[PDB]
Amino acid sequence: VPTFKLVLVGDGGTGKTTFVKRHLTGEFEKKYIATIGVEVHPLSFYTNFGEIKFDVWDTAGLEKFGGLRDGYYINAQCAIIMFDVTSRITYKNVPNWHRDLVRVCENIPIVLCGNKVDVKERKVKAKTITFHRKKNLQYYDISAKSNYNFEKPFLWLARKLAGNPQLEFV
Amino acid sequence: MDVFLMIRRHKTTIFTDAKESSTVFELKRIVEGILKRPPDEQRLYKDDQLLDDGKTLGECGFTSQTARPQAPATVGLAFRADDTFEALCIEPFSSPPELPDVMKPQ
Amino acid sequence: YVKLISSDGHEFIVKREHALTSGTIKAMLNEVNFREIPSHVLSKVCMYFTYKVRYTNSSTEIPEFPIAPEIALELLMAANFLDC
Amino acid sequence: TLKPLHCACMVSDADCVELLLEKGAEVNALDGYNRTALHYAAEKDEACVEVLLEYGANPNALDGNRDTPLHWAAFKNNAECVRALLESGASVNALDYNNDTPLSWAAMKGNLESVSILLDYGAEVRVINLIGQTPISRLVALLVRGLGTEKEDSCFELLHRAVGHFELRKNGTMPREVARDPQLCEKLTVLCSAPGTLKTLARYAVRRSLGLQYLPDAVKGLPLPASLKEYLLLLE
Amino acid sequence: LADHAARQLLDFSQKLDINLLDNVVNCLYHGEGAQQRMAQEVLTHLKEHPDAWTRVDTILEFSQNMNTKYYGLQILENVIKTRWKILPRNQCEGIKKYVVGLIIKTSSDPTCVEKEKVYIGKLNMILVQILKQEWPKHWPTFISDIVGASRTSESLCQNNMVILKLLSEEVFDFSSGQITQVKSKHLKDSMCNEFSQIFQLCQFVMENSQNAPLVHATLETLLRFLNWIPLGYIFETKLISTLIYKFLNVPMFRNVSLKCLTEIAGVSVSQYEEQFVTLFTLTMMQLKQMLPLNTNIRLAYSNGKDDEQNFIQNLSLFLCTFLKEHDQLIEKRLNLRETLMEALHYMLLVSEVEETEIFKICLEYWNHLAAELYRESPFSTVPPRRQLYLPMLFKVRLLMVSRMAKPEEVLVVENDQGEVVREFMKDTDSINLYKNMRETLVYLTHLDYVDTERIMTEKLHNQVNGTEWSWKNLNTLCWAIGSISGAMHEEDEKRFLVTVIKDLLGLCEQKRGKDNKAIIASNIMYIVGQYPRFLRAHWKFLKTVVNKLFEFMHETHDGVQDMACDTFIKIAQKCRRHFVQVQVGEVMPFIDEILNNINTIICDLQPQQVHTFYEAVGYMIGAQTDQTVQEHLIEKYMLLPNQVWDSIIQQATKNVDILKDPETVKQLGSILKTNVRACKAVGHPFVIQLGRIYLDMLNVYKCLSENISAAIQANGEMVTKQPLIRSMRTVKRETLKLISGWVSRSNDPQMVAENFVPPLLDAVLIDYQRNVPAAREPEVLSTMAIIVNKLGGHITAEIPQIFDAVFECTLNMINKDFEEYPEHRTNFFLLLQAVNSHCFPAFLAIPPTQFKLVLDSIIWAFKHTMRNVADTGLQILFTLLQNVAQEEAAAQSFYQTYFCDILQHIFSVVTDTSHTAGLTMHASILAYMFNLVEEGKISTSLNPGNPVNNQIFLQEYVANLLKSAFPHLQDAQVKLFVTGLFSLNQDIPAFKEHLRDFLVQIKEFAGEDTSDLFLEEREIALRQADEEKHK
Ligand SMILES: Nc1nc2c(ncn2[C@@H]2O[C@H](COP(=O)(O)OP(=O)(O)OP(=O)(O)O)[C@@H](O)[C@H]2O)c(=O)[nH]1
């Protein structure tokens, strides 16, 4: 049956672990438990064309608690490079993570997610996220707790990966 | 409720409103009001059918539904011409002209 | 009451205020003679007088006033002359 | 889902429609929406309407609801379109599935020009559609909402003159929406209660008598005085 | 499980078992649970130990599976990054030769590439690190050797182009934050000198070679290099011509050629105009060749595959960029007018693509064009540029109206441990898209308002007769109609909106069925809400709209009621004035009629709609100017909820245990929510309503606090899942929200302080202190924070009481660990910042122990991980330092007691990786501290060295501290860094970059001037910086 793996990247303070935790169990988490190394989370989805499962790998975004760095990316077919709209610096680091990712990937499907749009202090102004364009990256404004666009990244990745532009979750 | 009656005799024409319960004697005083002819010297007809002076308007051939102020009912009247009931004669109105060409039906 | 005489010589008797509806009659104001109004129109205008004064300021719906198409032209002319 | 002539009417280009009418056998041809191209011509421009009418386009072409092109011409207030369609012989009292005559739709918008033309061709004012509305009723409903301006006032004036007399107090009382406008409800009530001058009634009877022909030219043959025929043309 | 075999991998006393290492590395990528956990742990520990050479030189040889060699390369990269300059030169040369040999052996095995693609790429990365650290001086011939090997064979040329790409990246785009400023400058200078030698090889492989993989690699390399290549190579050669002719018109090269052409076009130089013109002309010719003007681009994209979609997007990018940058040039070039129009048509066709990103890209240029044209002349439609562009504007407007992002954004969110509400978003991506479209459309309307009117009329009519009837189309048209608002003179707006409303009502009558009726209802309700200017000139129509809205709020069909309430509040906000006055022909102000009917209008709305409706009414009342009339209005306005309030209060007085009745608690919460909305809308005068319930509100708040504390004690934290507990916590939060909101709106600080404040201190703060920590309400702090922010000094006297009540108990929550109780941290530090910024004298008065605890709290604050907490801590500290500059009496004591510790803590944070976010604040604080030092302050920080000027003692102290933290730093490094601190004192950006530079060095076992220090260069930079801040 179909199966893939998924690796999460993005400097700390941008909700990398919260996305996977929510999708796994559904309830939000507030504590900023810094991620260590990588955690393997088996994930599942159901669509009009059946069930597709992701083996999600959560790479810590902190230089001090990262682990193997790019080695985690070796077998990955898809990944989300995420940041925070409230913290401007988290955006300036997106190109660095993108570089560290591609050099070990063959332009696989990659989605750029700008987290924490529910916060009303949008430090990362819209109209200045032009980077994702010139690297053919799919950009989503998202929020982990308010669930805004909370399914678009996975849906788009499934569409590009399983190869079925009519794919849809149910 | 009440009904409106059209009183005619020869070229004469008089209009009035009368209740259904009104007796034809009431209409006799109404005639007297403008005409010097006493009531006994008056007799009334509905399309030549003599009207009993004691008969009430409701029970006669006149009623509000039958006659409207826009659509009255003609009433024939006769005097004692030479101390004798003159034969009822209502002079009809001048005949209407002929409809112009434009107004004929389709 | 007032007595109305048509062009054709027919005479019509109506109470004052009823017949008073006509502006021509108000200007006239106990007799009125018409050289242009035939009897078949004088009776029609009298019926209109009673109809209007009966349904004047009527709360309930006013039933339509039937008019014969044949007389319509001279009926309108007479109404204008009397400016009822 | 439409023929090229219908699209040409969509753009409403006189040259395109007239040159395509060389194939004009499709002029009276239905399409995906059942709209005869003359409908679009009426909706858009008068020149297309004229040129289509030149080549035997059916003025009374129906549709999915039988809303002949005259109805749409009136609804859009295309005065020239309406007058041309009528002059070419359109059914002034054409009835849709709701019986909404073109005059009813013209009143729906309070557009003065189309209403004036339709009355001038002896349109029927006392028509009532299935839902029960009437031209004057809809025009009043527009006034209640406060929309419109002196133009709608003049349109109401013309309809009041034409209808001879009218009543709005359904079941002896005004409709709820009208009630909330006392300074207008009073005017409507006093109009309803007034029987109407005999001259207006005679005018209405004459206008019914004339029928479907073009009245102001028709009245020229009448022996009535000039001022009074003008009155018959709702100049007062 | 094999952990007993696993933990040997860290056994460096014995030779590595390459087989076991490879097995564990592979199981990492093909393991799970404890296997993956301990595998990654062991690998991370293994990568850290010193004997990396013995492991690498063995793994790269005897490793079987590729990722194991990859892990070995990662270890060697760590070695090259950390210990490079301290390796013996023997091992240096051995490593260089070994890696170059491995690269040559692997690269040339097939003709162009092999399964080692990741492995060879990482080998390239290793060599790139070696080159970064050895190139300009130790290998002055590497570039020539690379060029020669490239000319020799393609199996070497392609990998050499990859190497050059990687190096150019690392040297010109990823330098800051990973390489010292001076070293980066040196490398960039060397590359500037050595490029041409690469450039000729590039031109050869581009114009003569024909190995498609190689040429694609060369095109990628040129793209990357173009970010910094000297423009002489770009615009003064045949590169553009070769690109266009030989590579833009074949599927596997057009993408990269187009990217390169885009990058070239983006340049903004002025004297390369002719090169740009030729670029545009040839590119358009080629585009016509491959992409004919009449192509169905939308269908092509929908059916096309990744290559076609990418080409479409990059075509869009090239056109947009070139036009935004130089379109004026071609516009001036008369003969190319046809090409200009053809490009505009290209972008029109592309705009039809359904992809959001592509549509946004095109809309960017569309907005730029519209704004430029509007600036050219503000009057509506002759301007030259406008005269030229006019024919396209019709299609521009048609597209803008046919597509229009929906302005609204509504979400359903559950919060407060299970309470669901409705929320709106401000500036998500979709809202910004709508904003851009609306701005462009408004400009266009200012150009040709008549044409916009005509188009919108036509589209609406098309909807009417069913020719184009569709919910999607109707909604889009309505959003487009609402987009313009006041865009035209109010007479034209009058006519246009009259026509639109007539048509929409006609359509509503025409259609039938609940679905169509609901859709049309939502549509018109939206349209009216967006045209307050018209409504304020038509009292009758406004009244009718309000009445119809009232009618709708009784509707049970979903979606109607919410939209009705939203429209009502939107109308009230923009039209509040007309509801509280007698309009012509009116007897009483319309507000009075509304108030009398509040009983029945809301008989069917759910509580949220009720609150929104009350908010709208409150907005409507605020317009009232007469104080007495306003008071009567407010009395009647709040009459209804007050009745339930008083009933519940009386019942509780009879028996307080009713407060444990969930229904009563819910009703109280609803009443408080209504009051909160009313306070938000009405503003300051709402106090009259507040005073009527202030005392019993606080009393019930206290009672609920007691109940919840007892429940938590008897049941622990788990009981918070009880809906009853949820309800009490609701009540509390809403009470606090009301109080804080009114204080925010209030404008009589003395009256507030002397009347409403003390009851809080009585019935809230001691409550907070008494409650079990778990149930303590974090919002409590925010209320006092806002109260202080508004009152300024008037509340100063009570600051010690507030602090003794809340401060000590709060810190014990947030000092044990960095994580738990985050909201508490945020609220507490907001309160602390407010106190410091407005009530500083309070800190002077409180005992010195309390001040010491406050400083400890600030340090603990800016030592947190969450960036918001850290920034708040740093801002608090900076404000505190600023204020102390005035309290000269205690300023010296504060310095002597805390300055050295604060400086130590700042350096501790800066020298840590997990806090680079607050680099700017660190720079500002340090610059301020050193300005205080150098400019002169009376006291001396060390009694034994009393005559010793602080300017010297601090230098020595900081140098010693840095040495203690980082022993491996060379004394010259630390001395230069400290001297620069003074030198870079007034140039805050220079100071920040100097801090980052120092942060770079500490990560490496730097050598004794072994290609790291550049001391003379730094001396010159700092000495002038010292002169710079001097003057
Ligand atoms: N406003 C807002 N904050 C969120 C949202 N999701 C998560 N957060 C906050 O961000 C933090 C996310 O922590 P993590 O899940 O570990 O993700 P991270 O911030 O990238 O940290 P690392 O995974 O270790 O790199 C949480 O502690 C939340 O406080 C959200 O949807 N909206």
Ligand SMILES: *[C@@H](CC(=O)NNc1cnccn1)n1cnc(-c2cc(C(F)(F)F)cc(C(F)(F)F)c2)n1
């Ligand atoms: C037409 C008939 C109607 O009322 N449709 N809506 C529903 C829906 N569900 C049940 C019953 N009726 N119609 C539709 N919308 C309007 C209308 C709405 C508004 C607004 F203010 F609510 F937007 C105002 C007006 C106005 F201005 F009074 F004409 C009409 N009418």
Ligand SMILES: [Mg+2]
């Ligand atoms: Mg995490």
